[PDB]
Amino acid sequence: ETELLVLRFREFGVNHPINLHSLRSKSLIRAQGKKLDLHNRVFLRRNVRAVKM
Amino acid sequence: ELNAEIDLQKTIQEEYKLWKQNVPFLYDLVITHALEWPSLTIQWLPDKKTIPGTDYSIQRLILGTHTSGNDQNYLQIASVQLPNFDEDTTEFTPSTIRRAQATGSYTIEISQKIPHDGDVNRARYMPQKPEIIATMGEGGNAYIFDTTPQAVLKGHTAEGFGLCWNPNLPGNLATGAEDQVICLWDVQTQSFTSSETKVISPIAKYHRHTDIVNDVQFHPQHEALLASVSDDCTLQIHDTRLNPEEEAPKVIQAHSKAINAVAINPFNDYLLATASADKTVALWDLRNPYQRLHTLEGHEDEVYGLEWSPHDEPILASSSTDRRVCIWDLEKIGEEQTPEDAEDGSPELLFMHGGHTNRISEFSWCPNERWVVGSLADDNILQIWSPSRVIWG
Ligand SMILES: [Br-]
Ligand SMILES: [Br-]
Ligand SMILES: [Br-]
């Protein structure tokens, strides 16, 4: 006694190991880039765009 | 407080309506089913059978009950008519074997109901012998059943939820409970008859955690490595060959809040995940164990459930009291996003399942299908779902 909310048949046709040292550096490097871009800004980017327009 | 409860029940109703509106654009398959009793546990059994003359296959789920009153508890096996919805998983050439449709009707029957003593806190089939199921039951006893009780395991002095078979040593079992203890067991099913219930005592007891032991798992490729996580905020790695009185060879302060689950990658022998009350999943390299690889952020409340995909090394699922099951793709870690895309969260958050209207109890990846998950919540609803191949392919 089951409700089928959606069924979409998958037609015919459409796996490398993770290097953990590479994952660790990508995690840390992305965190550096996201603190520089987003955290405690020193000016509002929208201010600059308005003045340059 | 009354207002909080009103607002929460309102928010959930709106969320569920909004989800249903978007289900056609999110999934290739969604099946819902109201169980007679809510279950605390779910696990797909390994077998799938294409049924000749139909548009479905039969696959099976291990469920339990938790009545907590004066009603009888049961270990249950449910049989699901899984519709043939995927060209890749079914041999359609014999055209007695038909393709399923959105208009089709598919059933779920309780195919086996075995009386169980107390809440079924967790149930797992022995990998080497799938007819054998271990449970965590009343007061901390663990129970063994032959589905084609056979034993009771006495050692815990409080109920528990950690339970795992050793995939490289048949009949070897580890358990962890709210008595702060981990017990190791040798379950020889040879002894089993059908008449009597054998009483087994532990082969070893670990007094290494200082709070509730929430989860244990053996390494898939090392018969002596046991991982455990606890409300004491530690992840611990035990060598079962060593003196139990000794400390665990490694104790990792993995989170600063309770750790509810541990999951060891089935393809990458050093990759391990922990799920915590701090709303986060942490990833670890066992070779470099005191420094976290990465933090998976996105859940809005405590994380309790955690299971790697059995088919794809970088794919991980987690569940939370935020009523979501999330699926993460480790290969996307560190990518950049447009501001609009970032509103949905980190790039490695691949998919979110928001169909449940209560706390999620447990989920289980379907081993015989592509990206199919069975998940449970407090309100007796079972969901069997599969995200759109457009998203993950
Ligand atoms: Br590596
Ligand atoms: Br401005
Ligand atoms: Br297991």
Numbering used by the authors:
A (entry chain B): 56 to 69, 74 to 112
B (entry chain A): 15 to 162, 174 to 418
Provide the authors' own sentences about this structure as they appear in the paper.
Centromeric chromatin in fission yeast is distinguished by the presence of nucleosomes containing the histone H3 variant Cnp1CENP-A. Cell cycle–specific deposition of Cnp1 requires the Mis16–Mis18–Mis19 complex, which is thought to direct recruitment of Scm3-chaperoned Cnp1/histone H4 dimers to DNA. As expected, Mis16 adopts a β-propeller fold, consisting of 7 WD-40 repeats, with an extended N-terminal α-helix that forms part of the histone interaction pocket.
We identified a N-terminal truncation of Mis19 (residues 51–112, Mis19C) that was capable of interaction with Mis16. The crystal structure of Mis16–Mis19C was solved at 2.0 Å by molecular replacement using Mis16 as a search model. Residues 56–63 form a β-strand that continues β-propeller 7 of Mis16 and stabilises an extended loop from 107 to 116, which is disordered in the Mis16 structure alone. Mis19 then loops across the C-terminal face of the Mis16 disc and then forms a helix (α1, residues 79–97) running diagonally across the edge of the H4-binding pocket. This helix leads into a short loop, and finally into the C-terminal helix (α2, residues 99–111), which sits in the H4-binding site of a symmetry-related Mis16 molecule. The first (site A) is formed by the Mis19 β-strand and proximal loop. The third (site C) comprises the C-terminal helix that binds to the same binding pocket of Mis16 as H4α1. In our Mis16–Mis19C crystal structure, two Mis19 molecules bind two Mis16 molecules in trans, with sites A and B binding one Mis16, whereas site C binds the second molecule.
